Amino acid sequence: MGEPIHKIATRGVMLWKEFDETIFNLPKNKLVPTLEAKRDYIISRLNADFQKPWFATVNGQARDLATMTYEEVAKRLVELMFIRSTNSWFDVTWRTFTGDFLRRVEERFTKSKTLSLIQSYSLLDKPDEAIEKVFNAYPAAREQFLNAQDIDHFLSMCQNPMQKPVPFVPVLDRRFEIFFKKDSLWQSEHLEAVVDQDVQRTCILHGPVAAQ
Amino acid sequence: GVATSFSRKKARTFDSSWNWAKQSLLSLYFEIIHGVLKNVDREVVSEAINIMNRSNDALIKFMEYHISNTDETKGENYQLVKTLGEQLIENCKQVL
Amino acid sequence: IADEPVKASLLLHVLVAHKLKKSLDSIPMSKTIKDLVGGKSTVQNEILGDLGKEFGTTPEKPEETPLEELAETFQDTFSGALGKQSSSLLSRLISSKMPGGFTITVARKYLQTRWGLPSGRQDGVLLVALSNEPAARLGSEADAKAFLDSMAQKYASIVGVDL
Amino acid sequence: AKGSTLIVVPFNQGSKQDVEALIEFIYDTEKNGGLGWDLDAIIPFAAIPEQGIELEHIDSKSEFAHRIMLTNILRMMGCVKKQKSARGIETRPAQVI
Amino acid sequence: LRAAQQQWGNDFYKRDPRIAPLRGALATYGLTIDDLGVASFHGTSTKANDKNESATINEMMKHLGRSEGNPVIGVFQKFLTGHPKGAAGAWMMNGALQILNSGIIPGNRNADNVDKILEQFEYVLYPSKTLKTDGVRAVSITSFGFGQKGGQAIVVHPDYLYGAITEDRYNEYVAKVSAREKSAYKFFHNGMIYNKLFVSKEHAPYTDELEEDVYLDPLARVSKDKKSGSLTFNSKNIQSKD
Amino acid sequence: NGNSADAAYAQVEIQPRANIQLDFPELKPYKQVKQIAPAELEGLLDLERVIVVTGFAEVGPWGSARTRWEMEAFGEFSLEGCVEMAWIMGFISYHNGNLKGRPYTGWVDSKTKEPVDDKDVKAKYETSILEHSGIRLIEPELFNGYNPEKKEMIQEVIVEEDLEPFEASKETAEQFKHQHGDKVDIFEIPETGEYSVKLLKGATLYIPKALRFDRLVAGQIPTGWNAKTYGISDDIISQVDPITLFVLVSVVEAFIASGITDPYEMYKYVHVSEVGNCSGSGMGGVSALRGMFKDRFKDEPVQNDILQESFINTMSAWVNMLLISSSGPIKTPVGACATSVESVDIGVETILSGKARICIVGGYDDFQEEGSFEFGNMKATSNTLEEFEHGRTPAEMSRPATTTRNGFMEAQGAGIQIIMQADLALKMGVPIYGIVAMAATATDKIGRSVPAPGKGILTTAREHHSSVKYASPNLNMKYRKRQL
Ligand SMILES: NC(=O)c1ccc[n+]([C@@H]2O[C@H](COP(=O)([O-])OP(=O)(O)OC[C@H]3O[C@@H](n4cnc5c(N)ncnc54)[C@H](OP(=O)(O)O)[C@@H]3O)[C@@H](O)[C@H]2O)c1
């Protein structure tokens, strides 16, 4: 809402400040032309420096949703949303997201009406085995990029208001500032759920004078 | 109810058994190769009867070619179609 | 109602809208000719050839200047006369559409009697009719009156008068 | 099989005119527009279902079904007899099943 | 090298009068007249055409000594489409490539009763229902236009090409196709749902200042423009020693 | 035991959604694909002189090449084929955003905007799809209100008694005067400035009358097909003849079948002078011809450039002007019913002369009133009233090689293939659907019937057999590999 916030100047916050000066101050007509122009830079900073990395990033290589397989996306969801150290889904809503997406994979690649291999999202509490199960029944979904209907569905599961904001930026469009800034304060109390457990990705509120 | 349906110009004739025989053989040949008809299906014996009943010189030659040029080493199905085929040729030469 | 001869700004807008098969508002006034028909080199010189007959004298490089500018450049010499090309189009509009017996005379007399519009405004209603050609053939007298009704309102809205 | 032929004709067995016309077609020469056959069997299995029609409900449908399943089978056999006896055919009877 | 491979690989028959152009086209890839499986017939549904076509195929195959009992399977696509004049053969050619790549030979579902006159032609077969074969190695496509325009094309199964290159070239090829096929599917669905399969070009890949320079350099190639992302001709890659 | 005991008993059902494939050719492992060719073939062929098809498309009565194949091969649509046809015919559109409060992403009825599940598409639309596809009764809405049951003509009648005057303009009235001479009287009405036209006894009028024509059926593009649905703009649709839109769609849909989404990608590999166009038509833009020969006569408002939209070579020009931008060969053939095969010959000889490396080939033709009527007076088309007398429905009227065949079934559309050198296809990594081994045209002989088919093409099997005792070493691929 354009209110000043005193944060510790981590790489993450220093990025935030740099995007305040160059991108989020621009008017609505100039925003999208500036994001498509600076795409490669923005993505390499989100991925290096920020607590919400660029979703579509497979083995360190920057992609887009449209150039990712259904497997690659399912695996990337489990990487960003499932905590290996605690062996649990950081939020039950993020599990619901990953299950909704594995059900969409079944729907797309099945030839006939059938039973879901994911009957309860409770099965995702071991998430590799649930992926290997779905993508062994539908081996075509390992070698095919997302249908354009499935990118639009995925992006509309990210805007779902009755769900904890996703820990990644899925696209660079008009809503980039809302993706970048929303639900920014929880990550400093829960560094297990941040990419490299790196505090320097996170936002820590803290006063200049009381820092002494 | 008593409204006429009949007209001579609507009579459809079907007499081209010379052509359907070759079709009926080739559909069998490939149905056996793809493993749709097995050696326990009665549909194979029904089909053999309907090919024998249309047996002429042209249809015999057509089988001789298709069966003599089957490679029996490509599968158990290609063996099964070569065996049955050779039998169907003898049967079609006998009832010519 | 007071008689006012037709503005060059209206006539021009109609002659351009008409020859692109496009509604009157679809084309904005503050835009060049060479923008609207940027593709086809033939339709450009055909619009310039038609404005050359309608008004008479033509400035230098008229397709690089907005219509708003060029409307005023024509307005000073233009004395509310339909001239050659617009007359020809209004004749064709009445003859190709319209029911039997509905001549331009009877369509003028109906705008006078009903909506009280004189010669100078009649012209302007007919130019608005020409921008909204119904692409059919008005079947009945009533259906045509209704059309001239709907064109009188659309003339009143653009000029700024009341009926 | 070899030598077999199947002529398919639209036909209403409820129509007397259809019955006469169908047999005239079968017996007429190929030049006149016919088949130039001579029936060796007639299997008139045409029928319509009459369901929940007791004595008191006997009406139009049953009077029509009686025409299809009796009266016109007799007219079909008549028409065959009249065609064969016009051609002097006394040695090749049609078998009516 | 190319002129030697052409002399012995591609064009060995052009001079030799004992090899038909139809035999040599198939011989190029080690096929024999017997390996021509399917004849996509012009098959207009006119009395004069459908006989003449069958007669022509039959006399070609009789001459080239196509084995007795190995008829060509007649495909008659116009039972379904009708005759679109100019497009007639393009549709046939599309159906032929779908046949080669699928091994399915579609049947003439309107073949109620094949004309008795056509029985004289032992080297053709008129199927009424679809046959899933084990493979079609070649298809013939014949057209008979008005004005004595007669035309034939032979289309060979593409798997006969890949036996003429190395395993390394084949696997380099397989990897590029696989990549392209994915990008193609991405484009197709996107374009389908956003009614933007067709995108008109606003501009040529060269500016009007470079038009004459690109036309006159045979080695000029487009490259990705870093700012716009669109493929254009750069002034640096025109009469370049590189 | 409550609703909690029988809640986890019931299982979740996955309903299939249409995942439409491009059907690229299935590439076998190298070891499998080396067993079908002879061993000698490796290094024998000059791959710059081997022509391959890398892409094909069509627009026809059954929509695309994908839909047409489904119906040709299997006689019925899959889910994918039914959705594709529904999209083509404009029955369904895609929606992504707010639909009656909820966020919806997926297909909707194009009229009602109500969501449509992919499973429902076949129940909701298949009947309407099959009814409005393929060979069916001519639909007036697709042919400028053309109705073969009511074919407008005009009869010249000498006027026997003077007409009631009508009012015209001065220009129009001088035009009536110039024509009719002293059989019309024009007089100024001073009050208004209009003119009264009076046609006298002996003048010539034309009175409309209708003919019942006996060709009622055709192979039309599916009802609802629109170039807008593929993304062609309104300004192009308004400019070009309809046949041009079939070609434009076919040409992009063919480049997609080749994996070439941006045609400029070609210019990473070839010069701008090495992309050919060899496609052509039998009659060309017959809607434009009808414009310049009939609508112009009737003083109807026709565009001024209508002539340029008639020319057969103009469809290939629009493809170059909107998609390709090449400076390569442009050989537009006119081969009537053999145009497309003539196009493949011209495209092959163009690539084998090194004048091009990629060539768009194919054919297009439209159905209109005039051609339909003239193919009827030639008795080339089936008489549809005779077909009805024989009990034949429209979809059983085109019946090749049948006892009772009686003429062709006119249709419209386009088909395109992209052909290229095999060397270049392997470098670009485009799919290869087929090799074009041969392509040949042939005339026939001294006759007097232009539509009579002849045996000329028989020449492609021409072979000297006086001396055939000993097999020629030239046909042996081992002898040829040895000499290489
Ligand atoms: N005065 C100060 O110094 C100070 C300091 C820190 C924060 N704050 C205030 O505290 C609030 C939160 O701070 P913030 O930086 O987190 O702002 P924010 O990013 O705009 O707020 C978080 C949003 O995320 C959603 N959300 C988060 N977790 C969720 C879950 N588990 N389930 C469902 N929805 C969830 C909520 O949306 P829905 O409402 O759609 O559920 C909520 O509006 C703000 O209003 C801010 O002004 C004030």
From Swiss-Prot, chain A:
Role according to the record: Fatty acid synthetase catalyzes the formation of long-chain fatty acids from acetyl-CoA, malonyl-CoA and NADPH. The beta subunit contains domains for: [acyl-carrier-protein] acetyltransferase and malonyltransferase, S-acyl fatty acid synthase thioesterase, enoyl-[acyl-carrier-protein] reductase, and 3-hydroxypalmitoyl-[acyl-carrier-protein] dehydratase.
Similarity-based family: Belongs to the fungal fatty acid synthetase subunit beta family.
Other observations noted: Present with 91800 molecules/cell in log phase SD medium.
Complex and partners: [Alpha(6)beta(6)] hexamers of two multifunctional subunits (alpha and beta).
Name used for this protein in its record: Fatty acid synthase subunit beta
Source species of the chain: Saccharomyces cerevisiae (strain ATCC 204508 / S288c)
Gene name per UniProt: FAS1
Curated annotation (Swiss-Prot), chain C:
Domain of life, source organism: Eukaryota
PTM comment: 4'-phosphopantetheine is transferred from CoA to a specific serine of the Acyl carrier domain by the C-terminal PPT domain. This modification is essential for activity because fatty acids are bound in thioester linkage to the sulfhydryl of the prosthetic group.
Domain Carrier: 6-81
Sequence positions bearing O-(pantetheine 4'-phosphoryl)serine: S41
Signal peptide residues on this chain, from the entry's feature table: none
Subunit structure: [Alpha(6)beta(6)] hexamers of two multifunctional subunits (alpha and beta).
Misc. remarks from the entry: Present with 17000 molecules/cell in log phase SD medium.
Function comment: Fatty acid synthetase catalyzes the formation of long-chain fatty acids from acetyl-CoA, malonyl-CoA and NADPH. The alpha subunit contains domains for: acyl carrier protein, 3-oxoacyl-[acyl-carrier-protein] reductase, and 3-oxoacyl-[acyl-carrier-protein] synthase. This subunit coordinates the binding of the six beta subunits to the enzyme complex.
Similarity remark: Belongs to the thiolase-like superfamily. Fungal fatty acid synthetase subunit alpha family.
Name listed for the protein in its UniProt record: Fatty acid synthase subunit alpha
Source species: Saccharomyces cerevisiae (strain ATCC 204508 / S288c)
Lineage of producing organism: Eukaryota, Fungi, Dikarya, Ascomycota, Saccharomycotina
Gene it is expressed from: FAS2
Swiss-Prot record, chain E:
PTM statement from Swiss-Prot or TrEMBL: 4'-phosphopantetheine is transferred from CoA to a specific serine of the Acyl carrier domain by the C-terminal PPT domain. This modification is essential for activity because fatty acids are bound in thioester linkage to the sulfhydryl of the prosthetic group.
Active-site residues per Swiss-Prot or TrEMBL entry: H42, H83
Family statement: Belongs to the thiolase-like superfamily. Fungal fatty acid synthetase subunit alpha family.
SUBUNIT field: [Alpha(6)beta(6)] hexamers of two multifunctional subunits (alpha and beta).
Miscellaneous comment as given in the Swiss-Prot or TrEMBL entry: Present with 17000 molecules/cell in log phase SD medium.
Function: Fatty acid synthetase catalyzes the formation of long-chain fatty acids from acetyl-CoA, malonyl-CoA and NADPH. The alpha subunit contains domains for: acyl carrier protein, 3-oxoacyl-[acyl-carrier-protein] reductase, and 3-oxoacyl-[acyl-carrier-protein] synthase. This subunit coordinates the binding of the six beta subunits to the enzyme complex.
Protein name: Fatty acid synthase subunit alpha
Annotated source species: Saccharomyces cerevisiae (strain ATCC 204508 / S288c)
